[PDB]
Design an enzyme around this catalytic site. Structure first.
Site, short mmCIF file in Angstrom:
data_model
loop_
_atom_site.label_atom_id
_atom_site.label_comp_id
_atom_site.label_asym_id
_atom_site.label_seq_id
_atom_site.Cartn_x
_atom_site.Cartn_y
_atom_site.Cartn_z
N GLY A 1 0.82 -1.19 0.00
CA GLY A 1 0.00 0.00 0.00
C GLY A 1 0.86 1.25 0.00
N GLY B 1 -1.10 7.39 2.16
CA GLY B 1 -0.32 8.17 3.10
C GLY B 1 0.40 7.29 4.12
N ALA B 2 -0.27 6.24 4.61
CA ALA B 2 0.28 5.43 5.68
C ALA B 2 1.49 4.61 5.19
CB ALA B 2 -0.80 4.51 6.26
N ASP C 1 -8.96 -5.02 0.33
CA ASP C 1 -8.01 -6.11 0.10
C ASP C 1 -7.29 -6.55 1.37
OD1 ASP C 1 -8.90 -5.78 -2.48
OD2 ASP C 1 -6.95 -5.22 -3.37
N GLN D 1 -18.21 4.84 9.01
CA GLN D 1 -18.59 6.23 9.05
C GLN D 1 -19.28 6.60 7.78
OE1 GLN D 1 -15.70 9.94 9.19
NE2 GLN D 1 -16.63 9.49 11.17
N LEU E 1 -17.53 13.30 -2.40
CA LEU E 1 -17.44 14.10 -1.19
C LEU E 1 -17.40 15.61 -1.40
CD1 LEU E 1 -16.98 13.98 1.92
CD2 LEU E 1 -14.61 14.26 1.44
N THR F 1 -16.20 18.46 1.36
CA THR F 1 -15.57 18.49 2.68
C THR F 1 -16.39 19.14 3.80
OG1 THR F 1 -13.63 19.24 3.98
CG2 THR F 1 -14.27 20.62 2.10
N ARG G 1 -19.74 13.34 13.22
CA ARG G 1 -20.30 12.90 11.96
C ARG G 1 -21.44 11.91 12.09
NH1 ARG G 1 -14.67 12.51 8.41
NH2 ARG G 1 -14.72 14.74 7.82
N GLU H 1 -5.93 3.29 7.38
CA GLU H 1 -7.33 2.91 7.40
C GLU H 1 -7.50 1.42 7.62
OE1 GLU H 1 -9.87 4.86 4.43
OE2 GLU H 1 -11.66 3.78 5.24
N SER I 1 -7.86 11.14 10.37
CA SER I 1 -7.35 10.04 9.57
C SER I 1 -5.99 10.38 8.96
CB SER I 1 -8.34 9.56 8.50
OG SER I 1 -7.72 8.58 7.67
N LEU I 2 -5.89 11.49 8.25
CA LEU I 2 -4.56 11.89 7.76
C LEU I 2 -3.51 11.94 8.89
CD1 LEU I 2 -5.27 14.62 4.99
CD2 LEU I 2 -5.02 12.10 4.80
C1 LIG Z 1 -12.49 8.90 0.67
C2 LIG Z 1 -12.05 10.17 1.33
C3 LIG Z 1 -11.39 10.06 2.56
C4 LIG Z 1 -10.93 11.19 3.24
C5 LIG Z 1 -11.11 12.45 2.68
C6 LIG Z 1 -11.75 12.58 1.44
C7 LIG Z 1 -12.24 11.44 0.75
C8 LIG Z 1 -12.92 11.59 -0.60
N1 LIG Z 1 -10.63 13.57 3.35
C9 LIG Z 1 -9.98 13.44 4.58
C10 LIG Z 1 -9.47 14.55 5.26
O1 LIG Z 1 -9.56 15.71 4.81
N2 LIG Z 1 -8.84 14.38 6.47
C11 LIG Z 1 -8.69 13.12 7.02
O2 LIG Z 1 -8.13 13.00 8.09
N3 LIG Z 1 -9.18 12.01 6.35
C12 LIG Z 1 -9.82 12.16 5.15
N4 LIG Z 1 -10.30 11.03 4.48
C13 LIG Z 1 -10.06 9.66 5.04
C14 LIG Z 1 -8.60 9.33 4.62
O3 LIG Z 1 -8.26 9.98 3.42
C15 LIG Z 1 -8.31 7.90 4.25
O4 LIG Z 1 -8.74 7.09 5.31
C16 LIG Z 1 -6.81 7.69 4.09
O5 LIG Z 1 -6.31 8.39 2.97
C17 LIG Z 1 -6.42 6.22 3.89
O6 LIG Z 1 -5.05 6.21 3.63
P1 LIG Z 1 -4.26 4.86 3.66
O7 LIG Z 1 -2.78 5.11 3.58
O8 LIG Z 1 -4.68 4.08 4.88
O9 LIG Z 1 -4.82 4.11 2.37
P2 LIG Z 1 -5.07 4.63 0.88
O10 LIG Z 1 -4.69 6.05 0.71
O11 LIG Z 1 -6.49 4.31 0.38
O12 LIG Z 1 -4.10 3.67 0.10
C18 LIG Z 1 -4.21 2.29 0.04
C19 LIG Z 1 -2.97 1.85 -0.75
O13 LIG Z 1 -3.03 0.44 -0.73
C20 LIG Z 1 -2.79 -0.07 -2.01
N5 LIG Z 1 -3.46 -1.37 -2.13
C21 LIG Z 1 -4.78 -1.69 -1.85
N6 LIG Z 1 -4.95 -3.01 -2.13
C22 LIG Z 1 -3.77 -3.52 -2.60
C23 LIG Z 1 -3.39 -4.76 -3.04
N7 LIG Z 1 -4.21 -5.81 -2.92
N8 LIG Z 1 -2.10 -4.98 -3.47
C24 LIG Z 1 -1.18 -3.95 -3.48
N9 LIG Z 1 -1.56 -2.71 -3.03
C25 LIG Z 1 -2.83 -2.51 -2.62
C26 LIG Z 1 -3.36 0.98 -2.96
O14 LIG Z 1 -2.81 0.92 -4.25
C27 LIG Z 1 -2.98 2.26 -2.24
O15 LIG Z 1 -1.71 2.65 -2.71
O1 LIG Z 2 -14.55 16.21 5.17
C1 LIG Z 2 -13.42 16.04 4.75
O2 LIG Z 2 -12.63 16.88 4.27
C2 LIG Z 2 -12.90 14.69 4.85
O3 LIG Z 2 -14.00 13.80 4.80
C3 LIG Z 2 -12.08 14.61 6.15
C4 LIG Z 2 -11.95 13.45 6.91
O4 LIG Z 2 -11.22 13.53 7.91
O5 LIG Z 2 -12.61 12.41 6.60
NA NA Z 3 -9.62 1.44 10.36
#
Ligand SMILES: *Cc1cc2c(cc1C)nc1c(=O)[nH]c(=O)nc-1n2C[C@H](O)[C@H](O)[C@H](O)COP(=O)(O)OP(=O)(O)OC[C@H]1O[C@@H](n2cnc3c(N)ncnc32)[C@H](O)[C@@H]1O
Ligand SMILES: O=C([O-])[C@H](O)C=C([O-])O
Ligand code: NA
Ligand code: HEM
Ligand SMILES: CC1=C(C(=O)Nc2ccccc2)SCCO1
Ligand code: SF4
Ligand code: F3S
Ligand code: FES
Lengths: 238, 105, 588, 122
Positions: free
Chosen positions: C14, C17-18, C221, C240, C252, C254, C286, C388, C404-405
């Site tokens: 993955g 960000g994490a 996954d 959520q 979304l 924000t 929320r 996540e 989350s970020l």
């Molecule tokens: C959906 C969303 C979430 C969000 C947001 C706005 C939207 C539209 N705004 C936020 C905000 O302003 N502040 C905040 O604190 N949180 C906000 N969120 C929630 C947050 O963005 C997400 O929870 C967070 O970005 C999740 O990050 P994480 O690093 O945990 O995961 P990801 O960004 O989705 O990346 C997943 C990576 O995993 C790889 N992956 C997935 N499956 C596989 C498999 N099977 N094999 C190899 N790699 C895999 C993906 O490619 C990706 O790189």
């Molecule tokens: O409302 C947002 O910008 C976004 O949805 C933020 C989090 O933390 O989830």
């Molecule tokens: Na979680």
């Protein structure tokens, strides 16, 4: 309403060369889907159709395509913007890059040029701040129009200079990025960055064709950033 | 390097723009184009120098421009270098032929 | 060995960000690290994050990490683990300032400091006056963060395996995780990535629902991989629903819109959050805002139009300048997906599946947990989880916006910082046998051999529909029991599902079929968990058990994959630097 | 070895790209044109007879057309060259709108000079 598509196909284990395949889709009359919606529905009917997509909202940069001759993102191009009586909607891969499969291109060269310009903050650590680096709103405004790039390559794959020398010309997206670091008040390596951009190719292949700025899905302007780099290059080396 | 090319193209363009204005200015106000007035115009030291200056400026300006064209469309090295040779020779021949022509007036 | 074996100290699955934060830390700490991602790293769902990063920088006003701890604990409705939350809120400022030093282009106050805006569930002095602690780059904070972390990975020369699809964890005879198998999307080659530490950072799973703010790639996954390896998942019922996805699109807008002064109206022009949350109003938690919008709709005070039922999100009184400067991203999203200019007209919005509070249970170090026969916590050797996909749990029953970020960065960094100690504590892991590796391929082979089975498109639709109807904002016992029976049938159909594209070069159909298995496991664990928790807490709301039950349910729910049954884990109530915040009635 | 989509007949080019390719074309033509003009000049200056001989050459319709073509390409090099330098020196904006607008105007100015060349040559 019946929608008609002509879509580029290529699978190296099956095709001698690429071909165009006709597709048809029944759509809802009083409703205007995005191109990506249509593609997803085509794959329900032809599972072999390969294309990239993720965010579906114009942010990730995955689904750059050449649509009716012009680059853009499938996820934010409405069918109504493409559809013409008696004509097919023509979907082809971004121009100039190798085609891996169907609408999927190898973005390698595009990423290599981005790396060439060192797209990361370079700060010599002298006079460190107490907390964050202090950057006034006026300094921060200079990054606006530059940091928003989503690396979709719509711009570069529409640039002829990038077609002829993808390994030497940095291309619009990469130069926009170089500029984003060139004018970041927090970056201390301006001179050394400019010294890597003085050759005949990196920057100066840009001849203001302006294909880059007409296609950018984020409304960014690589031509202007390039103009600014050129001034900085003159200011330093002429 | 790239900055050098860029500047030279523009420096020579300015010189060539002035030359064109000079030449067009002659043609638009000469009236009756007799041999006498024609040779009178190219006899003038002003016209001779300006013309040769223009030819040097072409050599610089067109070389840089043709080199850019070739480095886009002609990948095989030997063909490119040969074409550059033809082009540089043609440009040098231009300047040299110019000297032979103005010396003779 | 049939399969090529590519060995690293650490394999990070993955690059959101994490995983990018973790890879950077792991690599800087001296270890080799393969960073896998099924899409190019900057197309991860993190790019879409809008409003920003909640952190007590103290820029907009004097702040205190303990205030942020309070808001988080209360926001989590008292099942957030207090030691973990403490660690997050206290470490946050340093972790975030370090992103700024990486070049992250934060917005700025007049004096040069990082800009922070108000957001949901932010108070001064332990539940007092509204705070402003969300650090932002306009409303593109996720974009700014992900690109900056990608840039730092370039700078560091991280080894990145872009468009590799991780199939299944590989376990050795001792039960330790020793890497994963992965499919190279471009060529179709399958490989064993062997590792002392396999770090799941695969993100969320909103695509188990019919309508979600999440990218198409959010397929759970990591949940499916965990479950199939016998690793439990925790609090899966806690989903959520963001109050404000665009009605009809799911996209979304924000909470930043309400943070900047915007607010929710009903068909009568009532700012109803004033009734539902007298103190925090439109900046309530929320779970509360989402339920409130739905009640307005169920009771017939919702608006209608081409978008379907919705509330109005009014922003026009903020003015063109503020909107274009602070919220340009939503201007664009609203114009594109709602055909509404927020400068003039309210955005039609509805609560929308957004974020997975549940996931693989972990410690602060990132080490994944399971339980033994006695119900005692036991580290799963070789396995780690951040972001996540993890359930630390810092978010309990309801995540605060911006937290989350913050979690990605803090915990991604922590897993990296503690990796050497974690690897030394687990000791040497015995090698996977040839048959251990082959076990990881069973699921892929079933797909490659099934030509005449069922259409996976129908299966995916049935699954999403079932989750939308039965496991949404409001839940009923009978409907949840019936949903669960429905999923069981659907899951049976999935075992006989066909793969219609057999090719090897960039075959996205195979990928999406593999993803579907993970949608199914995630939905299934969610449904079992949701039936199990007989109370209402945070985002989990049931008419048959409407009250919060601190006598019986002050705990995490735990889904055990071997038995497909449920159990409980304690909530940590022992922070080190201040007293625990006791459970109390939670109103906004 | 992998196919590439570079079929120029399938790509839309905006007027700025047209302006640009024509500038390059005008450059190649003008480069050859100098030799032709020099050849003509040399003859016109060598003797009184050479002048009459150049006049007669210029008298042919086929030569008039080529000469008009040469002057048109030259005009185009100049006008669009100046447009380029106006951007370089910051007299013209580098927005897309300004680019289309300035290209259009360059076409108009070029056509006007082309007609003037016609009058000179006829
Ligand atoms: C959906 C969303 C979430 C969000 C947001 C706005 C939207 C539209 N705004 C936020 C905000 O302003 N502040 C905040 O604190 N949180 C906000 N969120 C929630 C947050 O963005 C997400 O929870 C967070 O970005 C999740 O990050 P994480 O690093 O945990 O995961 P990801 O960004 O989705 O990346 C997943 C990576 O995993 C790889 N992956 C997935 N499956 C596989 C498999 N099977 N094999 C190899 N790699 C895999 C993906 O490619 C990706 O790189
Ligand atoms: O409302 C947002 O910008 C976004 O949805 C933020 C989090 O933390 O989830
Ligand atoms: Na979680
Ligand atoms: C006199 C004979 C001339 C010849 C043979 C000539 C030839 C060329 C060539 C071959 C190019 C390369 C352009 C490309 O491929 O895009 C060029 C460019 C250029 N010309 Fe000229 N040119 C001439 C006169 C002039 C004049 C009088 C001007 C003044 C306006 C001028 C202005 C320019 C400029 C500014 C460029 C560079 C534009 C860019 O960077 O894209 N030229 N010329
Ligand atoms: C590379 C370049 C040109 C180019 O090749 N333009 C072009 C070629 C083919 C198709 C469209 C435009 S014209 C402007 C100077 O530089
Ligand atoms: S500048 Fe625009 S078109 Fe080019 S990669 Fe960036 S977002 Fe895409
Ligand atoms: S980038 Fe290319 S299309 Fe852009 S303006 Fe320069 S020649
Ligand atoms: S799918 Fe993300 S930009 Fe189109």
């Amino acid at each position: 309403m019946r929608l008609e598509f002509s879509i580029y196909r290529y699978n190296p284990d099956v095709d001698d060369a690429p071909r165009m395949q006709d597709y048809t889709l029944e759509a809802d009359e009083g409703r205007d889907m995005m191109l990506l919606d249509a593609l997803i529905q085509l794959k329900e009917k032809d599972p072999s159709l390969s294309f990239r997509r993720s965010c579906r909202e114009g942010v990730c940069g995955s689904d750059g395509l050449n649509m009716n001759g012009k680059n853009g993102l499938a996820c934010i191009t409405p069918i109504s913007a493409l559809n013409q009586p008696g004509k097919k909607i023509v979907i082809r891969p971004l121009p100039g890059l190798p085609v891996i499969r169907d609408l999927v291109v190898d973005m390698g060269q595009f990423y290599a040029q981005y790396e060439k310009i060192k797209p990361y903050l370079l700060n010599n650590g002298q006079n460190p701040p107490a907390r964050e680096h202090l950057q006034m709103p006026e300094q921060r405004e200079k990054l606006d129009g530059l940091y928003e790039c989503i690396l979709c390559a719509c711009c570069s794959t529409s640039c002829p200079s990038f077609w002829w020398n993808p390994d030497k010309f940095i291309g619009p997206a990469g130069l926009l990025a170089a500029y984003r670091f060139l004018i970041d008040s927090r970056d201390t390596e301006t001179d050394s960055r400019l010294d890597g951009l003085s050759d005949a190719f990196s920057v100066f292949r840009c001849h203001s064709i302006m294909n880059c700025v007409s296609v950018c899905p984020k409304g960014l302007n690589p031509t202007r950033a390039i103009g600014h780099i050129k001034s900085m290059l003159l200011q330093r080396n002429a | 390097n790239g900055v050098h090319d860029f500047i030279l193209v523009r420096a020579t363009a300015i010189v060539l723009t002035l030359y064109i204005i000079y030449m067009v200015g002659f043609f638009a106000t000469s009236g009756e184009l007799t041999y006498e007035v024609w040779i009178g115009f190219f006899a003038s030291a002003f016209t001779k120098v300006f013309t040769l200056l223009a030819l040097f400026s072409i050599l610089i300006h067109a070389w840089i421009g043709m080199w850019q064209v070739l480095t886009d469309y002609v990948k095989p090295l030997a063909l490119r270098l040969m074409l550059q040779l033809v082009i540089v020779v043609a440009l040098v021949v231009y300047v040299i032929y110019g000297f032979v022509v103005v010396w003779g007036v | 060995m049939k399969l090529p074996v590519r060995e690293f100290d650490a394999v990070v699955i993955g690059a959101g960000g994490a995983g990018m934060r973790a890879a950077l830390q792991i690599s800087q700490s001296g270890q080799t690290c393969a960073l896998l991602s099924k899409v190019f790293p900057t197309r991860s769902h993190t790019v879409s994050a809008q409003g920003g990063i909640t952190v007590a920088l103290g820029n907009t006003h004097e702040d205190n990490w303990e205030w942020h701890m309070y808001d988080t604990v209360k926001g989590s409705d008292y099942i957030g683990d207090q030691d973990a939350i403490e660690y997050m809120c206290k470490t946050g400022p340093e972790a975030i300032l370090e992103l700024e030093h990486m070049g992250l282009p934060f917005s700025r106050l007049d004096d040069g400091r990082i800009y922070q805006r108000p957001f949901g569930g932010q108070s001064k002095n332990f539940g007092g006056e509204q705070a402003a602690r969300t650090a932002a780059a306009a409303d593109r904070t996720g974009h700014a963060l992900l690109h900056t972390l990608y840039q730092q990975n370039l700078k560091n020369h991280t080894t990145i395996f872009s468009e590799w699809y991780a199939l299944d964890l590989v376990k050795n005879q001792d039960g330790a995780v020793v890497g994963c198998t992965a499919l190279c999307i471009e060529t179709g080659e399958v490989v064993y990535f062997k590792a002392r530490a396999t770090v799941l950072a695969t993100g969320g799973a909103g695509r188990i629902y019919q309508s979600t703010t999440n990218a198409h790639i959010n397929t759970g996954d990591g949940v499916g991989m965990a479950i199939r390896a016998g690793v439990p998942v925790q609090d899966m019922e806690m989903w959520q629903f963001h109050p404000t996805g665009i009605a009809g699109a799911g996209v979304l807008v924000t909470e930043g819109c309400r943070g900047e002064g915007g607010y929710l109206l009903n068909k009568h022009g009532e700012r109803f959050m004033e009734r539902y949350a007298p103190n925090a109003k439109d900046l309530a938690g929320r779970d509360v805002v989402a339920r409130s919008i739905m009640i307005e709709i169920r009771e017939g005070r919702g608006c209608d139009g081409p978008w379907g039922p919705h509330a109005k999100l009014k922003l026009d009184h903020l003015g063109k300048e503020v909107l274009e400067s602070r919220l340009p991203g939503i201007l664009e999203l609203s114009r594109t997906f709602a055909h509404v200019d927020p400068v003039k007209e309210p955005i039609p919005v509805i609560p929308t599946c957004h974020y997975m509070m549940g996931g693989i249970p972990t410690k602060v170090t990132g080490q994944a947990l399971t339980v033994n026969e006695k119900g005692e916590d036991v580290v799963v050797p070789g396995l780690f989880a951040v972001g996540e996909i993890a359930c630390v749990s810092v978010h309990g029953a309801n995540r605060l916006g911006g937290n989350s970020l913050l979690d990605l960065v803090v915990f991604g960094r922590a897993a990296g910082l503690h990796l050497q100690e974690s690897i030394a504590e687990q000791g040497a892991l015995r090698d996977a046998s040839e048959s251990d590796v082959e076990a990881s391929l069973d699921r892929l082979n079933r797909w490659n051999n099934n030509r005449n089975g069922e259409d996976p498109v129908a299966i995916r639709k049935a699954l999403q529909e079932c989750m939308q109807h039965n496991f949404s904002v409001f839940r009923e016992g009978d409907a949840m029991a019936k949903g669960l029976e429905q999923l069981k049938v659907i899951r049976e159909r999935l075992k006989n599902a066909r793969l219609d594209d057999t090719s090897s070069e960039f075959n996205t159909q195979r990928v999406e079929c593999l993803e579907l298995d993970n949608l199914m496991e995630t939905a299934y664990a969610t449904a079992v968990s949701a039936n199990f928790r007989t109370e209402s807490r945070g985002a989990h709301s049931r008419f048959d058990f409407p009250d919060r039950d601190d006598e019986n349910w002050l705990c995490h729910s735990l889904y055990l994959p071997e038995s497909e049954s449920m159990t409980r884990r304690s909530v940590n109530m022992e922070p080190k630097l201040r007293p625990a915040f006791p459970p109390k009635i939670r109103t906004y | 070895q992998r196919p590439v989509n570079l079929d120029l007949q399938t790509i839309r080019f905006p007027i700025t790209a047209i302006a640009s390719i024509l500038h390059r074309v005008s450059g190649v033509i003008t480069f050859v044109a100098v030799g032709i003009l020099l050849w003509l000049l040399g003859t016109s200056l060598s003797s009184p007879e050479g002048f009459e001989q150049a006049s007669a050459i210029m008298g042919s319709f086929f030569v008039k057309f080529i000469m008009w073509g040469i002057l048109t390409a030259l005009a185009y090099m100049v006008v669009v060259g100046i447009r380029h330098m106006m951007m370089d020196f910051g007299y013209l904006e580098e927005t897309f709108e300004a680019g289309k607008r300035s290209a259009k105007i360059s076409f108009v100015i070029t056509v006007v000079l082309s007609l003037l060349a016609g009058v000179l040559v006829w």
